[PDB]
Enzyme design. Structure first.
Site, PDB file in Angstrom:
ATOM      1  CD  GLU A  71     -18.534  17.090  -5.802  1.00 37.91           C
ATOM      2  OE1 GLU A  71     -19.230  17.257  -4.777  1.00 37.91           O
ATOM      3  OE2 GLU A  71     -17.759  17.959  -6.247  1.00 37.91           O
ATOM      4  CG  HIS A 100     -17.757  21.853   2.768  1.00 39.33           C
ATOM      5  ND1 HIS A 100     -18.511  22.292   3.824  1.00 39.33           N
ATOM      6  CD2 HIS A 100     -18.576  21.788   1.691  1.00 39.33           C
ATOM      7  CE1 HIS A 100     -19.747  22.498   3.408  1.00 39.33           C
ATOM      8  NE2 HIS A 100     -19.809  22.205   2.120  1.00 39.33           N
TER       9      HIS A 100
END
EC number: 3.1.27.-
Length: 108
Positions: A71, A100
Site C-alpha cells: 500500500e 480505509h
C-alpha cells in the site's frame, strides 16, 4: 511530489517502484513520526507513508500464490493520514480505496 492516484499508478507499472517521496512506516517512525500526533510533515517534510505490505486479511483483493500486496498513501500533504490508499501487487495490478480499505476498485 508524485502523490496522486494516476501519477503513482503510472509510476509503479512503468518503473516498478514508488516515487522518491515515499517512506515506509518503519522509516517514518525512525525519523520521529508519532501517528497519534499527526506530525509526519514536521519530521519528514514532503514525504508520504508507502511501500508497506498489505495483509489483505479479508481477502478482498484478488489473491494468488506468490502475489504480495503493498500500500501507499495518496493525496497526503500534512496532518493525520487521510483515508486514501493505492494498493499494488507484485504483478502490477493497481487498486484504490478511499474508505480505509473497506472498498476497492481497479484503476490499472
Amino acid at each position: 511530489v508524485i502523490n496522486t492516484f494516476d501519477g503513482v499508478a503510472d509510476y509503479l507499472q512503468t518503473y516498478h517502484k514508488l516515487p522518491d517521496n515515499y517512506i515506509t512506516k518503519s522509516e517514518a517512525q525512525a525519523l520521529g513520526w508519532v501517528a497519534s500526533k499527526g506530525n509526519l510533515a514536521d519530521v519528514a517534510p514532503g514525504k508520504s507513508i508507502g511501500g508497506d505490505i498489505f495483509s489483505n486479511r479479508e481477502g478482498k483483493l484478488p489473491g494468488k500464490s506468490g502475489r504480495t500486496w503493498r500500500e501507499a498513501d495518496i493525496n497526503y500533504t500534512s496532518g493525520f493520514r487521510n483515508s486514501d490508499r493505492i494498493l499494488y501487487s507484485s504483478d502490477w495490478l493497481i487498486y484504490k480505496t478511499t474508505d480505509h480499505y473497506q472498498t476497492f476498485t481497479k484503476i490499472r
